Design a protein around this ligand. Sequence first.
Ligand SMILES: CCc1sc2ncnc(N[C@H](C)C(=O)O)c2c1-c1ccc2[nH]ccc2c1
Ligand SMILES: OC[C@H]1O[C@H](O[C@H]2[C@H](O)[C@@H](O)[C@@H](O)O[C@@H]2CO)[C@H](O)[C@@H](O)[C@@H]1O
Ligand code: NA
Length: 513
Amino acid sequence: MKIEEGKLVIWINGDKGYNGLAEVGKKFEKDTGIKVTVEHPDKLEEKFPQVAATGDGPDIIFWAHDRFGGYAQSGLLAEITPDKAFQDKLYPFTWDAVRYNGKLIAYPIAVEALSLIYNKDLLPNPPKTWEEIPALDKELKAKGKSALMFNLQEPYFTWPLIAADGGYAFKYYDIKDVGVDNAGAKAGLTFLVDLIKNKHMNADTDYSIAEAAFNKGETAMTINGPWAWSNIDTSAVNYGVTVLPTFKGQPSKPFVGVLSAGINAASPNKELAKEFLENYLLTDEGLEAVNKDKPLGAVALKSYEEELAKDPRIAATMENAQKGEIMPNIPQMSAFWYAVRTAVINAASGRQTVDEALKDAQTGSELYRQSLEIISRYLREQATGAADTAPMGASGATSRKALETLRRVGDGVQRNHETAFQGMLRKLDIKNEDDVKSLSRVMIHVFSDGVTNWGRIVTLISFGAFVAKHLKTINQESCIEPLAESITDVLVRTKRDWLVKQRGWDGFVEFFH
Ligand SMILES: CCc1sc2ncnc(N[C@H](C)C(=O)O)c2c1-c1ccc2[nH]ccc2c1
Ligand SMILES: OC[C@H]1O[C@H](O[C@H]2[C@H](O)[C@@H](O)[C@@H](O)O[C@@H]2CO)[C@H](O)[C@@H](O)[C@@H]1O
Ligand code: NA
């Protein structure tokens, strides 16, 4: 099994206090003889699910809590079971952030929210509104400075503004209700785009560029989290940390993250990982070592948070946090961020209009759920002979028309392939939920081998329906939902970009109209 026993490998993002974490690791080694390696791989949040699915990767992964539901759904995390006395050492709301399907899937570390960071020597009174920024930038440009620079390549940083006037990810979670392309989101992202068009900001600005400009005194404000304050301390900029500006009179609403540590389900060192996280890291001295390297924010550990809470920068962080919302941890968060990242980048660069960009983001964010709705309904009605009577939601005319198209087209595909499907089904031993796991390997492989088009997607789904009929016949109707989920995963994981390019299921209805 790929992960080595008797050592701990930890992954944490490169903007965090990884040298402090490695000090905690040295302490552990001194008491236990177990060496701890801390690494900060690029794109770790994307790499983890790839490697862990093979039984490889780090023993411990640190990331905000939003990615952890996806990893837990995929079976990539160990359930953690801290006892009552340990649970009571942390804030309950930090535990809530790492609860998925009623199980704790990670240890919470610290609460992170973005704030407005400003240079007090350039801007003694920071703007209370977004709307006053253009005028401020004009005033600053006369003196060779700019008003505001922040990372436009990661949507986390633009989210507070998108959300201010009513953008939202998933309504509180109703995965059916997505608010990425509503009027509020459009208003916020249009304001950003106008800043860029009026040369108050540059579309190419990334994390490093914005940090460098702020810490060199070139720009009067940035938007960043507590991890950033160490580099600003070293630069000797006189800075303040404050509430984000309002937009259309309403607060900026940052997405609040709880930095959390999960244990790899494939680790043979789970007991050492638990001992390290509970008895070395989540202690006053452990968190202090980390926080001294790069500030964590509002830590989850009550004893130590009471000391940090007196710092005005933490107060500001918590003020922004209360105006914001805790991120969801559901599995489609990954897709939501991918869609939104592209929409912001393309709207900023002018490759797409705001309307265009947010439409595509809404399609991408809704794709898994919409696909599972169609596929699960078609498989279940095929298997049983009766349609599901529940409505689709308020966003569900697309689901409905896609199901109707699928019935029409799929009737013929199953009819014409009945002999071939009967043959393929016989080769396979599909008798219970264990077997369906295997099918995913087969179905991915077979599906990916050929060309990408709607006809072949209909054939994949049609075979799924043929299997569902068989499942029902042998009293394994409970396997139909897992089959539908597995087909949906295959389809959206391998064809997401192609699907969004087609306008999702509306494209399907169009192709076969
Ligand atoms: C694992 C079962 C799947 S998934 C799938 N996805 C798209 N298309 C498929 N079949 C067509 C003919 C295609 O490739 O266009 C299949 C088959 C499938 C099913 C039965 C068969 N008999 C011979 C070959 C074959 C293939
Ligand atoms: O930009 C989308 C991105 O947002 C959040 O990632 C944050 C992270 O939480 C912070 O700890 C800090 O590292 O900056 C990151 C943004 O660059 C989400 O947690 C992440 O899943 C998402 O992709
Ligand atoms: Na990164």
